[PDB]
Specification:
Chain B: Mammalian complex I is composed of 45 different subunits. This is part of a larger assembly, with seven protein chains of seven kinds. Chain A is an all-alpha fold and 86 residues long. Chain A contains four helices and no strands. The longest helix of chain A is centred in the middle third of the chain and has 15 residues. Helix content of chain E is 35%, strand content 0%. Classes of the chains: A mainly alpha (86), B mainly alpha (172), C mainly alpha (459), D mainly alpha (601), E mainly alpha (52), F mainly alpha (171), G mainly alpha (98). The structure holds cardiolipin (CDL), 1,2-diacyl-SN-glycero-3-phosphocholine, 1,2-Distearoyl-sn-glycerophosphoethanolamine (2 copies) and dodecyl-beta-D-maltoside (4 copies).
C-alpha cells in the first residue's frame, strides 16, 4: 500500500474528527484535549479511537487507546506503529 | 482484574460495538443500532450505586456473551486476523549485521558507518542508564514495569536500544 | 579383511606421529581413503558369500554395514574437532585412538566367521565406547550413563557367552558357514527355551528392545557428538546383525518365542513415537526416535520372511545415516546455545537459512518420504508384517502418523516461529558444519538410485 | 509411437530443468519466475501433441523405461501410463498451472523469496504428474506423498505465523491418516496378486476386493478431504492465494478422486464399495456446502466449495460413473482456479482484506475481476453450456436415474441448491451494494499479468467443457431417456437456490436485529468438528504418555537391584573386627558342614 | 621423503601390505583348486593353476 | 529383432490405413513429418556415427553356463563338501525360477495393455500360463523362510509328496 | 569455595578470521583441512564411488538369472515341457517314510 507521512496522518486524523458532530471543527486543533477542551467524555473517546481504527485499517488495543487524549497523541501513535519518520 | 470498573465498561462498549458491526454489515444499518446501543450505556451513565452499577455491568456481559457474533470481524493484522504475524519471517535482528563478511559490508560503506555511530552511542550511554535505574528503583525492586525518562541533557532514556532499533513492520 | 584391518591400525601411528596441528587433517584424509577402498567389498555373488579366509568373510548383510562403519570414522572426526579444540594435545590423540580402535573392532565384528570371535569383538566395542562417554562427556550424569550402558550390555552378553560355548560343545563348530549345513531343529523344552533367550537377549538390549531401552536415552544425552554418532549409526546395528545371524539355529522355536518380543516391539514403537511428541530435550527426542525405528527391525527379524530381512537390512543402513545426521544437526545448535532444550532456540530458519534446509532433508528421511531408502526399508517390513497378520497394518499405519507428527514438530519448533530475542550468538554456519551434513544426506539419497546394494543377502 | 512416446516424456522432463538449474545453480535469478512460467507454457504445448493423437486414433501406450529394482518375483520399473486419463489431465493441469504462475508473477511480486516460491510451485506440479502418470502403486506412492510434502511447505509459507505452522502440520496429519489405507492397498495387492502394477491388478481381477478397495477409499478420504478427514482443506487457506488456487484445482485435492478413478475396473464390480463411496460423498457435499452458507472469509467460502465439489465427484464414483467424475475434475479445474484468482485480485486491491463484510461496491470499480467472478460463479452453479454444465448436469441426471441410495440422492440435490446460495453470497457481498472498505482507495486491477492469467482461465471456463465433451471417446451408455422432472432437476433446484439466496441477502438490509439460531452457529462453526476434535484428539494423545506391573517393576528396577547389593554389602562388611567372633563362626561353619550337609561323609 | 610428509605413506602402505597378506592366505586354501564338481576342467597349453 | 520373440511374443500388428472423410488437413500428419525431419534424422545420424565406432572395435562377452552337480537328495548327511555344491546349485535355480515368474508376469502385463477393452477374453492363455507357473513356484519355495535352503525345500516337498500319496491311497 | 579457574568465555572463529571454514584457528591449516574433506569426501568417495557402484558387474547375478531364465523358457516351450514343475527335486531320488 502507498506509504504514509506525518503530515498525511495528521491530515486524515483531523479529517475524521471534522466529520464528528460532537466536535466543533473550528475549535479543533492537533493539541485539543478531547476531555478538557472539546468537552467529550470517556464514551466519546472510545468511538473516536474506533473511527481512527476504521480509517487506517488496524486495531489499537484498549490498554493503549485510553491514553490517546488529543489528536497529536493519535498521530504520534499511528506513526510509531507504521514506522513513519518523514 | 487489574482494570477499574470504568475501564471495564469502556472495553465492553468497544467490544459490543464491534460485534454489533459484524451482525449489521451494512453501514447504514450499523449506524442505526450503534446509536441505540450508545443510548443504553448513556441511560445508566450517572448511576452512583456501585452495587447497582456493578450489577448492570455483569448483566451486560452476560447479554454480550449470548449475542456475540460467532465469527466476528478481525483486522487482518490483529491477533487472530489473517495477516497476524505474516511478516515475522522477514524480521531479522540487527545484531546479525555484525556477522556479515567484510565483502558484504563493503557494499554499504555509508550504512555501516552510520551503524557504528549508533553502536558507539549505545556503548557510551549504557553505564549512565544502569545508574539512573538503580538510584530511582525503590528498595526491594520495581513495583511496576514503567521505565523513567531521561532527566539530564545528553542522557538517553534507560533501556532504549531494543525499542529504537527494532525491525520495521515491513522489513522486506 | 587384512586389506582393511591393517590400514585401520595404521591410522594410529599416523595420528601419533603427525605434526601437532595436523592430527585432524591427516586422520580425516586417510580415513576417507580407507572408506574409498571399502567399496571393493561389493564383489557379491548370487549364491556364495565372499569368504576370504578361515577368520573373516563378507556377505550382502555385512558389506553395507562395513561401508557404513568406515564412512562414519571421517565424519566423527569432523564432528569432534571443534569441541576438542582446547583439549590437551595428547588427550586429542587418545580420543582419536579410541575412535580408531572402535572402527577396528567393528569391521572385524561384522566379518568374523566364528561366533565366539564375533562375541569377543562384539563385546570389545564396550571399552572404547564407555571411555569416550565417561571421559569426554560434559556433564555429571556421564558417569551413571557409563555404568548403565556397561551393565545393561553385560547382563545379556554373559548369558550369550554360555549359550555359544554350549552350542559349540554339542554341534562341534560355531563357524557360521558350518552352522548353515549342520543346523538341527530346536524342539520344545524348558532347556531350549532358556537357550533361545540366552542367544537373543544380548542382541535385544543393543537394538534396544522396548522395555530394555532406558539405557539408550541416558547414554545419548551424556555422550559427546562422536559417541552419539557411532552409538546410533553402528552400535545399535550390532544387535540387529547378531539377530539376523543367530536366528538361523533357533528354528522352529522362534515361531512361538517371538510373540512376547513382537508385542513389545509393536506396542513399543507406538509408545516411543508418542513419547517423542513430549520430549523437552533434543538429543533425548532423537534417542527415543531410534527406539521406535529399531522396533520395526526387531519385528522384521523375528517373523523371518524374505521381505522382512530385506526391509530390516535397508532400515538399519537408512536409520544409521539419518540418526547420525540428526544428532549432528542438534549438536550444531548446541555448540552455539550450549543447551539441549528443544524450545530454547526457535525460529532458526531466519538466522541459518542453509542449515534449515539440512533440517528439512533430515526430517523428511526420518518420516520416510518415498522413495528414500528409509521408506523402502520401512515399507518392506510393513508388507511382510501384514502377511504375518493383517491386524498389524493398524499399528504400522498409526506409527507412520505419529512419526510424521514429531519429525515435523521438531522441525517446526526449532526452525520456524519467531527467533528467541535474547540469543544473539547464532554465528553463520561454518563450512565444516555444512560439509558434515552433506556427507550424511547425499550418500543417503544417492542409494535410492541403486538400492539393491543395501537389501541384504535375500535380494 | 515414436512421436507419441517421445513427446509425452519431454513434457515431464521439461518441467524438471528449471529445478535442475536452481539446484545446479547455472541459471540466472534475474527473472526466474518468468523462466518457470515459460517452461509450463512450452510443456503445455508439447503435451497437446500426444493428446491430439489420443483424440484421433485412441492411441494409448505404457512406457517402462528404467528397471529400478527387482524383489524376487516383484519387478519395479519407472513406468508411465499415457492413457485416456493421463492424456486429458496433463494439458488441463498445465494450462491452469500456466495461468497460476502468471498470476503469481504479480501477486507475489514483493515477496523476497519469490524464486523459492516458484521453485516450490513447480515441484508441486512435478509430483502431481508423477502421481497422474504412475503405472504401479509404488511410483504412484511417490507422487502421493510428494504432493503431501509440497502442500506442507507451501501452506506454511509464512513460517513466522503460528497458525500457518498449525495448518501445514494439520494437512500432513490428515493426509497421513489417509495413507494408512494406501499402505493397506499395497499390502493386499502384493500379498494376494503379487504385484503393484496396474495391468496385473486388472488382469487378475480379484473377486474379493473389499479390503484393498476400503484401503483406497480411506486414502481418498484424506487426500480429497471427504467427511471425517475434511477440516484440513479449509485450514489450508493459510498459504498464499496462488497456493490455494493450485492446491484446489489441478494438484493435491483431486488426487483422491483420481486414485479411485484409476481403480474403476475393481470398484465397478463391487457394490459394497459403491455404496460406501456414494454415502461418503453425499455427506461431504452437503456438510461443507452448508458450512459455506455462513462463512465470511472469501478464501474459506471457495475452499468449502471445493470440498462440496469433491464430494460430488465422490458421489459420481459411487454411482459407478468413473468417467463423469474425471470430466468433472477437468472442468472444475478451470473455474475454481479462476475464482481463487479473482478473490486474490480483490484481496490485493483491498490491502490484504479477506472478510466479505468489508468489501462491496466493487462491481464497477473492478470490472474485469467482476466479469470473471460472475462467469466463474455461473460455471460453478451449472449454468447451461458453461464449462461446469458439461459435467455437473450429466452427473445429476445419472444419479437420479440410477439404482442408488435415496438419502444420498436427496443430499446431493440439496447441496446443489446450496451451491447457488453461497455463490450468490460471494457475489452479493463482494460486488453489490455500497463500499464497506477503508477510505484510502487503492483499487487497481490493470496489471497485464493479472488480466492475461484470468483472461485465459475465463476462456476455459466458457468453452473448455464444450471442447472436452466433444473430443473424448465415449466409454459408457449415457442415460438420455427420463421424465422431464428428472431431466431438469439440477437447473430447477439451482434456480430455487438463487431465488432463495437473493431473498435472504436482501433480508440483511432491513433494520432488524436477530439472535443467532443454533442452526446458524452450527454452520458458522463448521459443525463444531474442528472445535471438538482438534482440542480433544490432540489432548488425549499428548497426555497419553496395576499391582502386577508393580512386581515387574519394583523387583527389576536398577534401583531395586542396586539397592539390594548395598544391603548385602553392608551385612558382609559391617563386622566388629573381633578375633572372638570370627573364630566362633568358624566353629559354626564346621558344625553345620558335618551335621547338616554331611561334607565329611 | 620430506620429514614433513613421510607419515602419509603409513596407511597407503598398510593397504598394500594388507592386500599382499590377503593374497598369501589364499595360497593356504588351494585344496580344491580345479577340483570342485562345478568348475574342474582340463588345463590350457600353458596354464598351471586355474587361479592363484 | 533384438530379443527373442519366442520368449516375449507379440501378435502381428494390424493398423488400419487412413481413410479421411474431412477436407481439413490432419495436424498429426504434419507433426509426424516435422518430427521425422527435425528429430528422427539428426538422432539417426548421431547413432550411425556411434555404430561406426563400435564396428571398428568388436569384442565379445559370454553367458556363463553352470555344469550340473548332485542335488541335496544325494548328499550324505552332514557332508558339507557335497552339501555346499548342492546348496549353491539350488540357490542359482531359485534365482532363475524367480526370473521365469517375472517373464510370465511380463507377458501377462503386456497382454492386458495390448488387448485393451477386450483383454478379459483375449488374454486367457497368458492368464492361464501365469496361474500354472505361480502354482509351481509356490509349491517349490513358498513358506521356506528367510533362512531357506535346499534342505528345507526338500523337507517341504517330502511332506507334500506324503500328502499326495495318502490322496491316492485314500481313493 | 576453593581455588579454581573461571569458565573461559566462548570464542568465535569468525572474530579473528572472517574467512574461517571452522576447521582450525590456523588459516593455513583451516584451508588445508577443508580441501582434504571436500576433495576426498566429494571428488573421490562420492563421485568415483557412485560411478564404481553404477558399473558393478552383474551384482548378485541378477542379469545372468534373467538371461538363463530366457534360455529355459525358450527351451521348454519349444519342446512342450512345463515352464516350471512343482517338484523341485526329482522324486525318483527320494524315499518317503513308511
Ligand atoms: C555422481 C555423484 C554426484 C554427487 C551428487 C550430486 C548432487 C548434489 C549436488 C549439490 C550441489 C549443487 C548445489 O549447489 O545446490 C544448490 C542448491 C540451491 O542453491 P541456493 O539457491 O543457494 O538455495 C539455498 C537453499 O539451500 C535452498 O533451500 P530450498 O528449501 O529453498 O530448496 C532446496 C531444496 C533441496 O534440494 C532438493 O531437494 C531438490 C528438489 C527435489 C527434487 O529443498 C527442497 O527440495 C524441499 C522439498 C523437498 C522435495 C520434496 C518433494 C519430494 C519429491 C519426491 C519425488 C522425488 C523424485 C525421485 O542448494 C541446495 O538446496 C543444497 C541441497 C543439496 C541436496 C540436493 C538434494 C537433491 C534432491
Ligand atoms: C530428473 C528428476 C529428478 C530425479 C532425480 C535426479 C537424479 C536422477 C538422474 C540420474 C540418473 C543416472 C543414474 O542414476 O544411473 C546411474 C546409477 C543408477 O542407474 P543404473 O543402476 O541403471 O546404472 C546405469 C549404468 N549401468 C547401465 C551400467 C547399470 O546410479 C548409481 O547407481 C549410483 C549409486 C550411488 C550409491 C553409491 C554411493 C557411493 C558410495 C559411498 C559410500 C559411503 C556412503 C555411506 C555408505 C552407506 C552404506 C552403503
Ligand atoms: C542372575 C543369574 C543367577 C541366577 C541363576 C541363573 C540360571 C537360572 C536360569 C537357568 C538357565 C537354563 C538352564 O540352566 O538350563 C540348563 C540346561 C542344561 O541342559 P544340559 O544338561 O546341558 O543338556 C541336556 C538336557 N538334559 O542347559 C541347556 O541345555 C542349554 C543351555 C543354553 C545356555 C543357557 C544360558 C542360561 C540363560 C539364562 C539367562 C537368560 C535370560 C537373560 C536375561 C538378560 C537380561 C538383559
Ligand atoms: C518405481 C520406480 C521409482 C524410482 C525412484 C528413483 C528415481 C530416481 C530418479 C530417476 C531418474 C530417471 C531415471 C531414468 C534415466 C536413466 C537411468 C539409467 O541409468 O538407466 C540407463 C539404462 C539402465 O538399464 P535398464 O535396463 O533400464 O535397468 C538397469 C537396472 N538397474 O541403460 C541405458 O539405457 C543407457 C542409457 C543411454 C543414454 C544415452 C543418451 C544420454 C545422452 C546424454 C545424457 C546427459
Ligand atoms: C533391565 C536389564 C539390565 C538391568 C541392569 C541393572 C543393573 C544396575 C545397572 C546400574 C548400576 C548403577 O549403580 C548405581 O545405581 C544408582 C541408581 O540406579 C545410582 O545413584 C543414583 O540413583 C540413586 C537412586 O536411584 C540415587 O540415590 C543417587 O543419588 C543417584 O546418583 C548410582 O550412581 C549408580 O552407581
Ligand atoms: C520373555 C519370556 C518368554 C516366555 C516364553 C514362554 C514359552 C513357554 C514354552 C512352554 C513349552 C515348554 O516345553 C514343554 O514342557 C515339557 C518340557 O519340560 C515337555 O513335556 C515334558 O515335560 C513334561 C513335564 O510337565 C511332561 O509332562 C512330559 O511328559 C515331557 O515330555 C513339553 O512337551 C514341552 O512342550
Ligand atoms: C541383572 C544383573 C545386573 C548386574 C549389574 C551389576 C550389579 C552392580 C551393583 C552395584 C550396586 C552398588 O551401587 C550403589 O547402589 C545404591 C542403590 O541404593 C546407591 O545408593 C544411592 O541411592 C540410595 C537410596 O536409593 C542412597 O541411600 C544412596 O545415598 C545413594 O548413593 C549407591 O549410590 C550405589 O553406590
Ligand atoms: C595416497 C595417499 C595420499 C595422502 C595425501 C594426504 C594429503 C594431506 C595434505 C596435508 C598438506 C600439509 O602439507 C604442508 O606442507 C608445508 C610445506 O610443505 C608444511 O610446512 C608449512 O607449515 C606452515 C603450516 O602449518 C606453513 O605456514 C608454512 O608456510 C609451511 O612451511 C606443512 O607442515 C604441511 O602441513
Amino acid at each position: 500500500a502507498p506509504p504514509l507521512t506525518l503530515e498525511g496522518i495528521k491530515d486524515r486524523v483531523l479529517y475524521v474528527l471534522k466529520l464528528y458532530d460532537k466536535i466543533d471543527p473550528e475549535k479543533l486543533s492537533v493539541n485539543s484535549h478531547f476531555m478538557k477542551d472539546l468537552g467529550l467524555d470517556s464514551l466519546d473517546q472510545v468511538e473516536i479511537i474506533m473511527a481512527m481504527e476504521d480509517e487506517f485499517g488496524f486495531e489499537i488495543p484498549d490498554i493503549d487507546a485510553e491514553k490517546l487524549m488529543c489528536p497529536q497523541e493519535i498521530v504520534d501513535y499511528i506513526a510509531d506503529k507504521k514506522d513513519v519518520y518523514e | 482484574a487489574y482494570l477499574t470498573h470504568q475501564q471495564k465498561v469502556l472495553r465492553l462498549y468497544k467490544r459490543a460495538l464491534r460485534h454489533l458491526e459484524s451482525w449489521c454489515i451494512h453501514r447504514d444499518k450499523y449506524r442505526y443500532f450503534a446509536c441505540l446501543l450508545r443510548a443504553r450505556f448513556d441511560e445508566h451513565k450517572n448511576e452512583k450505586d456501585m452495587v447497582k452499577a456493578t450489577q448492570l455491568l455483569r448483566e451486560a456481559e452476560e447479554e454480550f456473551w449470548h449475542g456475540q457474533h460467532p465469527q466476528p470481524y478481525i483486522f487482518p493484522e490483529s491477533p487472530g486476523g489473517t495477516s497476524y504475524e505474516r511478516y515475522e519471517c522477514y524480521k531479522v535482528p540487527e545484531w546479525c549485521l555484525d556477522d556479515w563478511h567484510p565483502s558484504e559490508k563493503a557494499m554499504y560503506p555509508d550504512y555501516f558507518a552510520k551503524r557504528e555511530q549508533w553502536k558507539k552511542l549505545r556503548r557510551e550511554s549504557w553505564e549512565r542508564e544502569v545508574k539512573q535505574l538503580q538510584e530511582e528503583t525503590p528498595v526491594g525492586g520495581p513495583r511496576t514495569e514503567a521505565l523513567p525518562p531521561a532527566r539530564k541533557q545528553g542522557d538517553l532514556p534507560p533501556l532504549w536500544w531494543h525499542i529504537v532499533t527494532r525491525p520495521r513492520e515491513r522489513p522486506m | 579383511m587384512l586389506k582393511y584391518i591393517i590400514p585401520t591400525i595404521m591410522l594410529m601411528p599416523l595420528t601419533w606421529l603427525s605434526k601437532n596441528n595436523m592430527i585432524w587433517v591427516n586422520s580425516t584424509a586417510h580415513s576417507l581413503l580407507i572408506s574409498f577402498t571399502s567399496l571393493l567389498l561389493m564383489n557379491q555373488f548370487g549364491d556364495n558369500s565372499l569368504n576370504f579366509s578361515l577368520l573373516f568373510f563378507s556377505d550382502s548383510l555385512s558389506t553395507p554395514l562395513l561401508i557404513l562403519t568406515m564412512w562414519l570414522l571421517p565424519l566423527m572426526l569432523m564432528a569432534s574437532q571443534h569441541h576438542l579444540s582446547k583439549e590437551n594435545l595428547t588427550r586429542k590423540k587418545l580420543f582419536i585412538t579410541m575412535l580408531i580402535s572402535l572402527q577396528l573392532f567393528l569391521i572385524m565384528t561384522f566379518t568374523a566367521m566364528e561366533l565366539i570371535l564375533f562375541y569377543i569383538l562384539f563385546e570389545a566395542t564396550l571399552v572404547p565406547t564407555l571411555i569416550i562417554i565417561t571421559r569426554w562427556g560434559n556433564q555429571t550424569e556421564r558417569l551413571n550413563a557409563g555404568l548403565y550402558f556397561l551393565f545393561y550390555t553385560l547382563a545379556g552378553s554373559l548369558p550369550l557367552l554360555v549359550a555359544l560355548i554350549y552350542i559349540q560343545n554339542t554341534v562341534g563348530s560355531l563357524n557360521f558357514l558350518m552352522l548353515q549345513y549342520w543346523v538341527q531343529p530346536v524342539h520344545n523344552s524348558w532347556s531350549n527355551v532358556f537357550m533361545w533367550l540366552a542367544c537373543m537377549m544380548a542382541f535385544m538390549v543393543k537394538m534396544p528392545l522396548y522395555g530394555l531401552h532406558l539405557w539408550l536415552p541416558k547414554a545419548h544425552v551424556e555422550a559427546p557428538i562422536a559417541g552419539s554418532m557411532v552409538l546410533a549409526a553402528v552400535l545399535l546395528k550390532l544387535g540387529g546383525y547378531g539377530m539376523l545371524r543367530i536366528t538361523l539355529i533357533l528354528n522352529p522355536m522362534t515361531d512361538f518365542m517371538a510373540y512376547p518380543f513382537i508385542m513389545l516391539s509393536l506396542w513399543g514403537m507406538i509408545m516411543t513415537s508418542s513419547i517423542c511428541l513430549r520430549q523437552t530435550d533434543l538429543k533425548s527426542l532423537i534417542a527415543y526416535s531410534s527406539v521406535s525405528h529399531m522396533a520395526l527391525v526387531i519385528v522384521a527379524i523375528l517373523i523371518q520372511t524374505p521381505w522382512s530381512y530385506m526391509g530390516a537390512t535397508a532400515l538399519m543402513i537408512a536409520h544409521g545415516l539419518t540418526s547420525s545426521m540428526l544428532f549432528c544437526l542438534a549438536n550444531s545448535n548446541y555448540e552455539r546455545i550450549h543447551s539441549r532444550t528443544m524450545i530454547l532456540a526457535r525460529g532458526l530458519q531466519t538466522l541459518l537459512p542453509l542449515m534449515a534446509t539440512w533440517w528439512l532433508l533430515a526430517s523428511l528421511t526420518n518420516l520416510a518420504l518415498p522413495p528414500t531408502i528409509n521408506l523402502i526399508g520401512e515399507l518392506f517390513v510393513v508388507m511382510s508384517t501384514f502377511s504375518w497378520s493383517n491386524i498389524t497394518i493398524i499399528l504400522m499405519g498409526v506409527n507412520m502418523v505419529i512419526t510424521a507428527l514429531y519429525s515435523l514438530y521438531m522441525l517446526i519448533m526449532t526452525q520456524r516461529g519467531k527467533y528467541t530475542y535474547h540469543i544473539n550468538n547464532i554465528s553463520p554456519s561454518f563450512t565444516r558444519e555444512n560439509a558434515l551434513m552433506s556427507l550424511h544426506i547425499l550418500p543417503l539419497l544417492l542409494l535410492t538410485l541403486n538400492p539393491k546394494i543395501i537389501l541384504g543377502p535375500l535380494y | 509411437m515414436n512421436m507419441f512416446s517421445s513427446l509425452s516424456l519431454v513434457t515431464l522432463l521439461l518441467l524438471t530443468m528449471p529445478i535442475m538449474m536452481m539446484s545446479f545453480n547455472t541459471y540466472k535469478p534475474s527473472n526466474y519466475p518468468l523462466y518457470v512460467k515459460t517452461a509450463i507454457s512450452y510443456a503445455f504445448i508439447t503435451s497437446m501433441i500426444p493428446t491430439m493423437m489420443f483424440i484421433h486414433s485412441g492411441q494409448e501406450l505404457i512406457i517402462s523405461n528404467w528397471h529400478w529394482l527387482t524383489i524376487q518375483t516383484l519387478k519395479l520399473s519407472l513406468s508411465f501410463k499415457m492413457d485416456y486419463f493421463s492424456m486429458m489431465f496433463i494439458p488441463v493441469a498445465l494450462f491452469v498451472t500456466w495461468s497460476i504462475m502468471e498470476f503469481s508473477m504479480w501477486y507475489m511480486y514483493s515477496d523476497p523469496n519469490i524464486n523459492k516460491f516458484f521453485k516450490y510451485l513447480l515441484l508441486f506440479l512435478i509430483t502431481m504428474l508423477i502421481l497422474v502418470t504412475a503405472n504401479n502403486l509404488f511410483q504412484l506412492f511417490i507422487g502421493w506423498e510428494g504432493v503431501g510434502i509440497m502442500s506442507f511447505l507451501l501452506i506454511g509459507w509464512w513460517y513466522g505465523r503460528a497458525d500457518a505452522n498449525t495448518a501445514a502440520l494439520q494437512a500432513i496429519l490428515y493426509n497421513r491418516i489417509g495413507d494408512i489405507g494406501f499402505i493397506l492397498a499395497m499390502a493386499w495387492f502384493l500379498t494376494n496378486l503379487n504385484t503393484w502394477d496396474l495391468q496385473q491388478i486388472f488382469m487378475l481381477n480379484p473377486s474379493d476386493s473389499n479390503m484393498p478397495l476400503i484401503g483406497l477409499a480411506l486414502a481418498a478420504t484424506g487426500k480429497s478431504a471427504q467427511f471425517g478427514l475434511h477440516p484440513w482443506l479449509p485450514s489450508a487457506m493459510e498459504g498464499p492465494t496462488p497456493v490455494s488456487a493450485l492446491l484446489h484445482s489441478s494438484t493435491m485435492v483431486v488426487a483422491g478422486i483420481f486414485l479411485l478413478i484409476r481403480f474403476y475396473p475393481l470398484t465397478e464390480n463391487n457394490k459394497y464399495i459403491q455404496s460406501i463411496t456414494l454415502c461418503l460423498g453425499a455427506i461431504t457435499t452437503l456438510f461443507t456446502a452448508m458450512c459455506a452458507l455462513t462463512q465470511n472469509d472469501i478464501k474459506k467460502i471457495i475452499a468449502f466449495s471445493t470440498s462440496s465439489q469433491l464430494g460430488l465427484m465422490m458421489v459420481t464414483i459411487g454411482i459407478n460413473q468413473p468417467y463423469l467424475a474425471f470430466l468433472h475434475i477437468c472442468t472444475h479445474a478451470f473455474f475454481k482456479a479462476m475464482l481463487f484468482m479473482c478473490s486474490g485480485s480483490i484481496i490485493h486491491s483491498l490491502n490484504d482484506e479477506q472478510d466479505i463484510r468489508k468489501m462491496g461496491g466493487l462491481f464497477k470499480a473492478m470490472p474485469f475481476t467482476t466479469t470473471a467472478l460472475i462467469v466463474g460463479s455461473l460455471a460453478l452453479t451449472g449454468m447451461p453450456f458453461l464449462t461446469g454444465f458439461y459435467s455437473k448436469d450429466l452427473i445429476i441426471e445419472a444419479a437420479n436415474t440410477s439404482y442408488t441410495n435415496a438419502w444420498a440422492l436427496l443430499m446431493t440435490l440439496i447441496a446443489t441448491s446450496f451451491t447457488a446460495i453461497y455463490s450468490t453470497r460471494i457475489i452479493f457481498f463482494a460486488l453489490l451494494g455500497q463500499p464497506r472498505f477503508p477510505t484510502l482507495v487503492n483499487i487497481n486491477e490493470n496489471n497485464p499479468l493479472l488480466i492475461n492469467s484470468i483472461k485465459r482461465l475465463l476462456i476455459g471456463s466458457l468453452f473448455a467443457g464444450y471442447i472436452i465433451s466433444n473430443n473424448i471417446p465415449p466409454t459408457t451408455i449415457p442415460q438420455m431417456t427420463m421424465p422431464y422432472y428428472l431431466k431438469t432437476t439440477a437447473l430447477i433446484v439451482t434456480i430455487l437456490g438463487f431465488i432463495l439466496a437473493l431473498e435472504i441477502s436482501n433480508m440483511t438490509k432491513n433494520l432488524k436485529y436477530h439472535y443467532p439460531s443454533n442452526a446458524f452457529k452450527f454452520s458458522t462453526l463448521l459443525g463444531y468438528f474442528p472445535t471438538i476434535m482438534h482440542r480433544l484428539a490432540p489432548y488425549m494423545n499428548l497426555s497419553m504418555s496395576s499391582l502386577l506391573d508393580l512386581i515387574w517393576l519394583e523387583a527389576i528396577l536398577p534401583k531395586t537391584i542396586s539397592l539390594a547389593q548395598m544391603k548385602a554389602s553392608t551385612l558382609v562388611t559391617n563386622q566388629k573386627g573381633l578375633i572372638k567372633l570370627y573364630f566362633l563362626s568358624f566353629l559354626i561353619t564346621i558344625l553345620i558342614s558335618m551335621i547338616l550337609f554331611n561334607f565329611h561323609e | 621423503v620430506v620429514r614433513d610428509h613421510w607419515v602419509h605413506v603409513l596407511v597407503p602402505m598398510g593397504f598394500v601390505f594388507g592386500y599382499y597378506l590377503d593374497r598369501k592366505n589364499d595360497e593356504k586354501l588351494t585344496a580344491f583348486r580345479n577340483k570342485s564338481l562345478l568348475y574342474k576342467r582340463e588345463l590350457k597349453p600353458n596354464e598351471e593353476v586355474t587361479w592363484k | 529383432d533384438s530379443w527373442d520373440k519366442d520368449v516375449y511374443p507379440e501378435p502381428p500388428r494390424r493398423t488400419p490405413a487412413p481413410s479421411p472423410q474431412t477436407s481439413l488437413p490432419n495436424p498429426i500428419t504434419y507433426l509426424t513429418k516435422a518430427f521425422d525431419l527435425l528429430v528422427d534424422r539428426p538422432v539417426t545420424l548421431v547413432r550411425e556415427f556411434i555404430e561406426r565406432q563400435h564396428a571398428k572395435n568388436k569384442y565379445y562377452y559370454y553367458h556363463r553356463e553352470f555344469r550340473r552337480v548332485p542335488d541335496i537328495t544325494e548328499c550324505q548327511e552332514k557332508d558339507v563338501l557335497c552339501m555346499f555344491e548342492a546348496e549353491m546349485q539350488w540357490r542359482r535355480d531359485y534365482k532363475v525360477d524367480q526370473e521365469i515368474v517375472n517373464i510370465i508376469q511380463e507377458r501377462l502385463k503386456a497382454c492386458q495393455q495390448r488387448e485393451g477393452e477386450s483383454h478379459r477374453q483375449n488374454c486367457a492363455k497368458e492368464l492361464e500360463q501365469f496361474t500354472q507357473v505361480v502354482k509351481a513356484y509356490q509349491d517349490r519355495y513358498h513358506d521356506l523362510g528367510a533362512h531357506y535352503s535346499a534342505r528345507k525345500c526338500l523337507a517341504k516337498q517330502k511332506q507334500r509328496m506324503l500328502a499326495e500319496r495318502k490322496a491316492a491311497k485314500e481313493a | 569455595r576453593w581455588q579454581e579457574d573461571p569458565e573461559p568465555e566462548d570464542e568465535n572463529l569468525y572474530e579473528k578470521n572472517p574467512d574461517s571454514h571452522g576447521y582450525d584457528k590456523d588459516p593455513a591449516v583451516d584451508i588445508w583441512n577443508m580441501r582434504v574433506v571436500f576433495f576426498f569426501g566429494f571428488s573421490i568417495v562420492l563421485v568415483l564411488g557412485s560411478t564404481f557402484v553404477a558399473y558393478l558387474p552383474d551384482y548378485r547375478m541378477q542379469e545372468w538369472a534373467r538371461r538363463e531364465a530366457e534360455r529355459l523358457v525358450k527351451y521348454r516351450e519349444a519342446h512342450g515341457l512345463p515352464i516350471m514343475e512343482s517338484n523341485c527335486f526329482d522324486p525318483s531320488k527320494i524315499q518317503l517314510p513308511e
